[PDB]
Design a protein around this ligand. Structure first.
Ligand code: PSJ
Ligand code: PSJ
Ligand code: MN
Ligand code: MN
Lengths: 286, 286
């Protein structure tokens, strides 16, 4: 495992629907302006990013970067189609290479399956293939000082693991020192028996955190018990990335946004949303 | 409005994944054993139901019945395909006919669209088509002394309306005396700004309630603020059906369960779950 620090990040889609040269500048300037330690770049297509341009922007605004992604049908590492697993491995290697080039140390999100709504439950083979793929990815990432954090998401976004408890059982089959649990308050709000159980169970295996309101809008205007969740992080003295994550129809990534079913306009002002979110988080943690 | 009374029901999928002679009896016996006033039949294919058999079962167990359903792609009344909208009209008419033959008074659930994930946001055409289909259904239902209740569901299950406030605007566009809002605590837990606002706004327009835990499991083992929700119902003196709704991989309807992404086992003992649920509800609204 590679060093983790308590640091606060903003998800790219708070600012930019695309990672164009302009999109990258807007989002990096945005996160820096709001007082975030890092930007979390969504690498659903890790070939599209101009890596040298982004590195220059990170230097220019004195900002760090981590990376999240979700696979697609074409790159689903759970697939019993070996060719599809191989495309997944390839995308995950490229995502790792981009992260390393940007000086990042965390590759997180739905990296262990296709992000979206499976029409049926995962077979034993689906899970086994995901475990093996996360073993190959962890081993690849280990050579480049990178930790992987598997994001537990709700039933509409994966059929592999929907609770931190399920994630930990999975991580125990993976059995890699640089593979961690990634929890997200939005997803926890749906799946978890309260906001503390999985955090307490994870302890040092909790490698990465997403802060999202129940509707993914303004923090504290929804149903997420943040009092409970932040008390739990304290009880294990969590010291790792915490990125604010929010999706509004105002800022749209043609794939990610429709996959995430973001039908509603829950905000318009990126800077106001991100500014208030960071104040909300730091008032309750750190 | 056709008569509504404060009464408690169990959703069929608490007991049975099919509506065969054996499945119908298992669900109706289960509801009766737990002391529910009614069973809610999941009528996703209303041509499947043996109506005489079910009517006999309802007599045998001294139980009333309401029906919920979700449309599918082939019967989507939001569709810009007039043949698909027509198929929707036909299925909802058949559903109404079944409910009428069972002496039921409530057709509820996702009757206004295809239950599931849409590839993009609903157009004003999609919504207009839905409102007009719900007008036609309400008028057909009214001839048979049946109320319809529009169930607001989360972003992964509809693009038409995800909050009670959105539900009420759709409802008033329908503009029919026997059309009502249907709220579900599980969906509210995701989309709503607290558990009171939509209920207080709805008042007499709220015609049907589903009680589901955040994870659709045992009541009071999740994240739903039931205290706030039940306080709000009291404020508006809600006197309508209240269905306990829960899904576990323990009991599978091979269509509905997969559509609802029930990957996890949240319970194994139907009678324990249903019994404890009713006690939980009557303790807070009895
Ligand atoms: O919560 C999420 C999706 O619902 C994750 O943050 C995303 O899958 C991913 O991180 C986006 O890049
Ligand atoms: O909660 C629901 C689905 O998530 C609705 O009640 C269902 O679509 C339907 O009513 C089940 O029959
Ligand atoms: Mn997340
Ligand atoms: Mn429901």
């Amino acid at each position: 495992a590679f060093p983790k620090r308590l640091e606060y990040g903003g998800h790219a889609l708070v600012w930019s629907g695309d990672w164009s040269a302009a999109g990258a500048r807007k989002a990096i300037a945005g996160a820096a302006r709001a007082g975030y330690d890092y930007i979390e770049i969504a690498l659903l297509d890790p070939w599209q990013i101009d890596v040298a341009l982004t590195k220059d922007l990170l230097q220019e605004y004195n900002l760090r970067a981590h990376a999240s992604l979700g696979l697609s049908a074409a790159t689903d590492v759970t697939s019993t189609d070996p060719a599809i697993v191989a495309k997944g491995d390839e995308l995950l290697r490229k995502a790792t290479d981009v992260l390393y080039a940007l000086g990042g140390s965390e590759l997180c999100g739905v990296i262990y399956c296709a992000l979206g709504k499976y029409p049926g439950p995962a077979s034993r083979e689906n899970r086994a293939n995901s475990v093996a793929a996360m073993q190959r990815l962890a081993d690849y990432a280990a050579d480049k000082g990178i930790n992987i954090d598997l994001e537990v998401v709700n039933r509409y976004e994966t059929n592999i693991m929907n609770t931190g408890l399920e994630g930990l059982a999975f991580l125990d089959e993976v059995n890699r020192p640089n593979a961690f649990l990634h929890l997200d308050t939005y997803h926890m709000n749906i799946e978890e028996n309260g906001m503390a159980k999985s955090v307490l169970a994870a302890g040092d295996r909790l490698g990465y955190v997403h802060i999202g309101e129940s509707h993914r809008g303004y923090l504290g205007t929804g149903n997420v018990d943040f009092a409970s969740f932040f008390a739990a992080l304290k009880q294990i003295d969590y010291r790792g990335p915490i990125t604010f994550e929010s999706f509004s129809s105002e800022i749209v990534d043609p794939k990610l946004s429709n996959t995430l079913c973001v039908w509603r306009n829950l905000w318009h002002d990126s800077d106001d949303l991100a500014g208030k979110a960071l104040e909300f988080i730091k008032q309750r943690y750190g």
